């Protein structure tokens, strides 16, 4: 592992628009969480019954 490697990583991610600064496996769930459609909102759920 190098610093050049690290800076390239940062560069790439901040380019493609993914996570910027180093973050826990835990906290990433927040990203995943807004990045989705919350389960209760899915048309396949709330509109279940005619």
């Amino acid at each position: 592992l190098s610093e050049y490697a690290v800076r390239m990583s940062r560069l790439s991610a901040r380019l493609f628009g993914e996570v910027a600064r180093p973050t826990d496996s835990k906290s990433m769930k927040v990203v995943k969480l807004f990045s989705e459609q919350p389960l209760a909102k899915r048309k396949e759920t709330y509109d279940w019954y005619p």
């Binding site: 190098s2 050049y4 490697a5």
Partner: protein, 81 residues
Amino acid sequence: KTEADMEEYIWENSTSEKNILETLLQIKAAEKNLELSKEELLGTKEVEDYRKSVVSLKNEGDNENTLSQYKESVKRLLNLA
């Protein structure tokens, strides 16, 4: 930049370069030839055969040809015919 980061094996500042340098150091010290230049050494056709052979061995990888080039270059380099 780190030199392990590269996509090529550049002969410049290589470890193979240092190793040959020491090799020809001991080769001159054994032959009682007092001529010492990194210029003189690095210039020779032999060190060039090794440039090409090791650059091709790192970048192309393991091959029959490539080790025949390694064979010949180290052959002439170490005086084995």
